[PDB]
Structure 1
Amino acid sequence: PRAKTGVVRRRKHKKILKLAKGYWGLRSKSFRKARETLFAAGNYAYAHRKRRKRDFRRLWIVRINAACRQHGLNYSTFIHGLKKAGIEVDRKNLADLAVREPQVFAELVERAKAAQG
């Protein structure tokens, strides 16, 4: 019962080779360089998936700190009213009222500036 290889490594190289599309040069055509990239593409695909949340937060702090500053208070003054006043509403995902429609976010500034003491 001789079991030669035959089809299974051609299918296995087609899975990695057709999984690795759009790469520079021999790491999209050759099979020994396609799996050396998809390992790093998987590790970068994990770590940058962990980094997307924190990077979007680092965008949200710049949008909130950018929008609140011209009212006469910065970010550290702004959050101190929210954590103490029981008005934890914004929660840094609600920057789209500081961007889209600021006539109510300005009222959130009015609720936050009176909560300094």
Structure 2
Amino acid sequence: LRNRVTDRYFRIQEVLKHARHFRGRKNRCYRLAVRTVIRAFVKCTKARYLKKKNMRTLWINRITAASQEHGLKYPALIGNLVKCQVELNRKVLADLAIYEPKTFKSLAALASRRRHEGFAAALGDGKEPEGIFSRVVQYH
């Protein structure tokens, strides 16, 4: 054996330090550990697409929960906060509902005033002057 491997101990511990919190022999035996440490790393990067998915689904379920307290549905709140050019995203709107429920009651009041201004413009077809909260601000 001219040169055989003298540092094979440290190549095993590169993998086995990630497996210390496993079950069974996956935390000890190297042959069983690499098929799970690799699989624990692929799931770690495929769940960067699911954290952003499961946070937005959580924010939608926390805006839908709080908009129902004021009688609004979720598409009646997001759809009419856009129309008032109030570009708040789902993270803040779900964190306004928990920590500032007076401001969230004002955003539910505003998104329902614009909704009623959208119906009153739609039942009165033909040229009518616009609503007060329905006037867009133009940028040039």
TM-score norm. by structure 1 comes to: 0.91
Match of 2:15 in 1: 16
Match of 1:93 in 2: 91
Match of 2:138 in 1: none
Name which one, 1 or 2, has greater alpha-carbon Rg: 2
Stretches of structure 1 that go unaligned for 5 or more consecutive residues are none
Match of 1:33 in 2: 32
Query: How many angstroms apart in 2 are the aligned matches of 1:27 and 1:36?
Result: 9
Match of 1:55 in 2: 54
Stretches of structure 2 that go unaligned for 5 or more consecutive residues are 119-140
Alignment of 1:70-109 (within 5 A): 70-89=69-88, 91-94=89-92, 95-109=94-108
Query: How many angstroms apart in 1 are the aligned matches of 2:47 and 2:85?
Result: 34
The amino acid that maps onto 2:6 is G
Deviation of the 1:81 alpha carbon? 0.6
Q: Secondary structure, in 3 states, of the residue corresponding to 1:19?
A: coil
CA displacement 1:30-84 (0-9 Å, x = unmatched): 0001111011101111111220111011111010000011212100111111122
TM-score norm. by structure 2 comes to: 0.77
Q: Secondary structure, in 3 states, of the residue corresponding to 1:115?
A: helix
The amino acid that maps onto 1:28 is N
Deviation of the 1:19 alpha carbon? 2.4
In the TM superposition, structure 1's runs of 4+ consecutive aligned residues that sit over 4 Å from their partners are none
Match of 2:123 in 1: none
